[PDB]
Amino acid sequence: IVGGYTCGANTVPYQVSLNSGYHFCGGSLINSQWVVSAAHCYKSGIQVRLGEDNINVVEGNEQFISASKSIVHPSYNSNTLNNDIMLIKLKSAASLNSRVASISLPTSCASAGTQCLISGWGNTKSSGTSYPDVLKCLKAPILSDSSCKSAYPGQITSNMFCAGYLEGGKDSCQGDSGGPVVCSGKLQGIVSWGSGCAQKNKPGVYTKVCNYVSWIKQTIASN
Numbered sequence: 001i002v003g004g005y006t007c008g009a010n011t012v013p014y015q016v017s018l019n020s021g022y023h024f025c026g027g028s029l030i031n032s033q034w035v036v037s038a039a040h041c042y043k044s045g046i047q048v049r050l051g052e053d054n055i056n057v058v059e060g061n062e063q064f065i066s067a068s069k070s071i072v073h074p075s076y077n078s079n080t081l082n083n084d085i086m087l088i089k090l091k092s093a094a095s096l097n098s099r100v101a102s103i104s105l106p107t108s109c110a111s112a113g114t115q116c117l118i119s120g121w122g123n124t125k126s127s128g129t130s131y132p133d134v135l136k137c138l139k140a141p142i143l144s145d146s147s148c149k150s151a152y153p154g155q156i157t158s159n160m161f162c163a164g165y166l167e168g169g170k171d172s173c174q175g176d177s178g179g180p181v182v183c184s185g186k187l188q189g190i191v192s193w194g195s196g197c198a199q200k201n202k203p204g205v206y207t208k209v210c211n212y213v214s215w216i217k218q219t220i221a222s223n
C-alpha cells in the first residue's frame with residue numbers, strides 16, 4: 001500500500017496473509033473455512049495466516065491453517081486478468097472472534113464514488129521498494145467506469161473496476177495482490193492489477209466481486 005496508513009493491529013479482522021514460506025498475497029476470510037483471493041495468486045502449498053498484524057513476529061492472535069484446496073475461477077484468463085478470483089478452503093475451520101472475523105459478500109454492486117478500505121502488506125513505495133511488516137490501509141473511492149476505461153484503453157472488462165486517485169500517490173502495490181477492497185462492510189473488490197503503483201492517471205484495478213457471488217456461494221455449497 002502506497003500513501004496509506006498503519007491500520008492498527010487486528011483492526012481489519014478479515015484480512016489474511018497467504019504464506020508459502022513467506023508472505024506472497026493477501027486474501028479475505030468470508031466464512032470459517034473459506035478465503036477469497038486473486039486467481040493470479042494461485043500456487044500449491046498455501047498456508048493461510050489469520051489474525052496477523054506484524055507478519056514477521058508472532059504477536060498472539062494468529063491462526064495458521066493450511067489450505068486443503070484452491071479453486072481458480074473457471075474463466076480466469078491470466079493474460080487479460082479477466083475473472084481474477086480464486087477460492088481457498090482451509091483444512092480446519094478458523095476460530096472466529098473479534099480479531100479473526102469474516103467479511104460479508106455484497107448483495108449489490110457498489111457505485112462509483114463509494115468510499116472503500118484497501119489493505120495489505122505490499123510495497124509502500126511508488127518508486128523503490130520497502131515492505132512493511134505491519135498491515136497498511138488506504139481509504140479510496142471507486143472511480144467511474146468511463147474514467148477507468150480511459151485510464152486503461154482496451155483492458156477494462158465488466159469484471160473489473162478502478163479505485164484510487166488519478167493524481168497518483170495512493171494505491172495498492174506489489175504484495176497487496178489478492179487482498180480486500182471493502183465498502184460499507186461488504187467485500188466489493190480484490191487487488192488485481194495496474195500499471196506500476198500510485199502512478200498518475202493509472203489507478204488500481206480490482207476484481208468486481210459482486211459479479212461472482214453466485215459462483216462463490218454455489219462453489220462453497222458443494223466443496
Ligand SMILES: NCCc1c[nH]c2ccc(Cl)cc12
Pocket residue numbers: 171172173174175176177191192193194195196197203204205
Ligand atoms: N494497484 C496494485 C496492482 C498490483 C498488483 N500486483 C502488482 C505487482 C506489481 C505492481 Cl507494479 C502492481 C501490482
Ligand SMILES: [Ca+2]
Pocket residue numbers: 052053054055056057058059062
Ligand atoms: Ca504475526
